[PDB]
């Protein structure tokens, strides 16, 4: 089949429970990509349909700040998802290396993430799993694009119609509405953007407990603050944008298109 004929495989870039990502070259085109490789015989039909779902949602999306899926090739024993190669690693890794970002750098970062998220929302896709582990730097060069990845938990929504679709996401990034079994939709991604923006500016999250019982109570209550001294020199407008994203009521919470016009993003 077409992958073995058209591509050469090189070094491992990343690994999951059920996948390996290797650099590949589309030999006749002289173009590099990242191949996410799944051993199909080791997976259930349920795991297969989750993969088909991910590929289907990725193909809806064409944006400079979203990892593009170029091809999907099912060979005997292995399935290949051919994505953009990105070489700058996870935003999570960048934040640990730098400790935290300047307001200028954090504004530039969250602007690109909001552009990606708005594009998803306009295409009726809710990601549900926004986190720095899931945002990739296109390269290691300064100013390299941040790109949304891992649509394995994403859902398709019908206009603005909401429901409790189910319990999905990453504990520290979960929205109050998801934890309360309230109807949800696009706003869950803006809550995660808030958690991300908080982390960018000081290098730790607004909600953390070893004890998940306490973590979920803390998220549902909107129980975060801005401790001294690190937050004392942070502009009020940066705090205001975080507060508008970490609004417990998902109706009142800032939208992606609204956040893109907030003066902390717009005035640059």
């Amino acid at each position: 089949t077409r992958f073995t004929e058209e591509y050469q495989l090189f070094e491992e870039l990343g690994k999951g429970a059920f996948s390996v990502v290797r650099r590949c070259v589309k030999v006749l085109a002289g173009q590099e990509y990242a191949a996410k490789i799944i051993n199909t015989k080791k997976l259930s039909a349920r795991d297969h349909q989750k993969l088909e779902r991910e590929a289907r949602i990725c193909r809806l999306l064409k944006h400079p700040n979203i990892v593009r899926l170029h091809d999907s090739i099912s060979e005997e024993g292995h399935h290949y998802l051919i994505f953009d190669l990105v070489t700058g690693g996870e935003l999570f890794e960048d934040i640990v290396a730098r400790e935290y970002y300047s307001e200028a750098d954090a504004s530039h970062c969250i602007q690109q993430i909001l552009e990606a998220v708005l594009h998803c929302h306009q295409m009726g896709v809710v990601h549900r799993n926004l986190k720095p582990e899931n945002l990739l730097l296109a390269s290691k060069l300064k100013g390299a694009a941040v790109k949304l990845a891992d649509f394995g938990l994403a859902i398709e929504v019908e206009g603005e119609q909401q429901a409790w679709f189910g319990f999905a996401g990453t504990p520290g990034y979960l929205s109050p509405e998801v934890l309360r079994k309230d109807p949800y939709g696009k706003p869950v991604d803006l809550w995660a953007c808030g958690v991300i923006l908080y982390i960018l500016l000081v290098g730790y999250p607004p909600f953390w407990d070893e004890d998940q019982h306490r973590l979920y109570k803390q998220i549902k209550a909107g129980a975060y603050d801005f401790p001294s001294p690190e937050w004392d020199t942070v502009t009020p407008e940066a705090k205001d944008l975080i507060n508008k994203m970490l609004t417990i009521n998902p109706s009142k919470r800032i939208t992606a298109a609204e956040a893109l016009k907030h003066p902390w993003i717009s005035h640059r």
Partner: peptide, 14 residues
């Protein structure tokens, strides 16, 4: 820890 938390990787989904 006085408001400062660790940044800990969260790979595991619910």
């Amino acid at each position: 820890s006085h408001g400062r938390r660790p940044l800990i990787r969260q790979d595991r989904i619910v």
